Amino acid sequence: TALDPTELRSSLDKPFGTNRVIADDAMMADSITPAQYRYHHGSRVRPVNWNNIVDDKDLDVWNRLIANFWLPEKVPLSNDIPSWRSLTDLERKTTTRVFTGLTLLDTSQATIGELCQIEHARTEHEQAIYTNIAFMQSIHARSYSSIFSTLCSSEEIDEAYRWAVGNDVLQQRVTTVLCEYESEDPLKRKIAATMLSSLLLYAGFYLPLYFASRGKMMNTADMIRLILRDKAIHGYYSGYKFQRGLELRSENDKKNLEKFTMNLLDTLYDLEVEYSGQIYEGFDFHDDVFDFVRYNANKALMNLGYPAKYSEEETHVSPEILAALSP
Amino acid sequence: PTALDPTELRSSLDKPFGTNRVIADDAMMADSITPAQYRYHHGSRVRPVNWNNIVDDKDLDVWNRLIANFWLPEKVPLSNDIPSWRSLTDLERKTTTRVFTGLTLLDTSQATIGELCQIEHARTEHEQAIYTNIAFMQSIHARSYSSIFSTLCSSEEIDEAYRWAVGNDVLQQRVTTVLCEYESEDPLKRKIAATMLSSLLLYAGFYLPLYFASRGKMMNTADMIRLILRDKAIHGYYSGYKFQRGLELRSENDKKNLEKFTMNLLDTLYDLEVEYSGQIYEGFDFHDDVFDFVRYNANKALMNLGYPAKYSEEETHVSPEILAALSP
């Protein structure tokens, strides 16, 4: 039926009774998580039970992500102020723009991208993990503003955010991902999330890693490595859960999901060349940036269980950038 | 399941953005949107969160306080309550495990959908980030009841309590009543429900560990409960604050609808609390004090939404021992 705006939406459903029983095995098996309720009105909803782990990997990932909790306030970013001032004008402008673009991807993952993975999650503990990951992705996004607050003028921050809104290719990149989060196929959401965490930010992460390899912006680099410590697990876990859902799908669906994955990757790679090629046009490390992009694209594919797409020659990251990845 | 070929990107259905790069003028910035709003505004430009452009100072204050209050159940020495737990009666232990499993169900719901559905129609981008912290901390709350069970309970006791919760019709009616409102397209109905969850629905359960602490029992568990209460008091205040920020931009028609809806939801949830917690606490002499405490917190939920109190001082007189237990 229809509903008056003052009435409760649950009045459209059959009420549960007032019976109390100790649920038997069938009643427990038919119970569902709260995020599934909207598809199954009248089903019984089950609280999370951390003393009944279904996949031991979930407990390990939960414990590790929580133990890695950090805040940008704990990094002495203000000790980068002399280094920041020693950069060129172009270096400072490029940093603010790159980091504002990274903010846009992490904002997207925090506020919808990671959350849209909950309703079709394989386990209730995995659902709780996505709530931690989304909060930490809000921390990642917030931390780029922490950098700007320490180093930048209001005018610099203002122009960088206007540049981001006004950058058509950046808009194409983020909206490409956001559309897949709406997919009716839960595994396409997981593929997109794995791409965000294991690929889409790395052309940007190249810049602070480059600064660190040159001895600059050293404290900022520590924070970037805290972000990377999170994202490496985020992307591994997204891809692991994709593979656990994939093994239950039909052969035809597996073929289509692999084709879709390569279509998504190829589209996002071409967009990265367009976007970061233009951003880095006044820098002589163009070729190394895309070796590094392809290097991380292979990791994203491996996280999904697919073979590497790019060759050793196409993924040869300079040894100074790889050294800057570790503390 | 749509008719788009499964290998195609869903963005292929939309006109792509161009290849222009401009410094967005004020009109372009005003029309930009948060990522969570993109779903029903395809083609709009999406904007990254700017913590150096705070729209509502209250958002920065709430964010900073909630993050400062981060805690984990592993830091509470719950195992020091094992002697106190074993000094209780079997009925007290069974009642506690069941009550906490019912609290787990409400926090599980809020963590995994209830708080997260507040993001898409949030007033500010910083508020959206705050909801991600709140949802995570609600997962911590739900997790923390399992931490209690792992410390105090046998495998059989935990298993039976989860079966009790799934099989408790009234508990199911309570949770699904809230879950249904989170499906409304009216963001303020979502906000009212979240305010009720954080400021009312768990308090008949919280009464029990406060009662034990007032009798000198389960003292370390009480500390953890106070950590949970320290979060929920802000969660409920903030949900109600944001409701009022949205409410003041609504028509007189919608204001009248939302006030009646609020009282309908409260009245329904209250009656269900009487049925649910009245049955659970039937064997205890504090039964009537529980509902003074329920009505006391119902008044706080209403006050958080900006509405007048419903219950009188005589209907909300919580015993001084329970109120003292709320403090360290």
Author numbering:
A (entry chain B): 7 to 333
B (entry chain A): 6 to 333
Per the authors:
Class I ribonucleotide reductases (RNRs) convert ribonucleotides into deoxyribonucleotides under oxic conditions. The R2 subunit provides a radical required for catalysis conducted by the R1 subunit. The discovery of a metal-free R2 defined the new RNR subclass Ie. In R2e, three of the otherwise strictly conserved metal-binding glutamates in the active site are substituted.
We first crystallized R2 expressed alone and solved the structure of unmodified BvR2eQSK (BvR2QSK-tyr) at 1.8 Å resolution in space group P3121 with four monomers in the asymmetric unit forming two homodimers that correspond to the physiological active form of other R2 subunits. Of the 364 amino acids, residues 6 to 333 could be modelled in the electron density. The N-terminus is extended and contacts the second monomer of the dimer, creating a large interaction surface of about 4300 Å2 and forming 6 salt bridges between the monomers. The typical interaction surface for published structures of R2 is between 1000 and 2500 Å2; the area for BvR2QSK is therefore much larger. The active site residues are well-defined. There are no metal ions observed in the active site. Residues Y150, H146, H240 and D112 are in the same position as in other R2bs. The remaining glutamates that usually bind metals in the site are as expected from the sequence substituted to Q143, S203 and K237. The position of Mn1 is occupied by the ε-ammonium group of K237 and in the position of Mn2 a well-defined water is bound. The DOPA containing R2eQSK can support ribonucleotide reduction in vitro while the unmodified protein cannot.
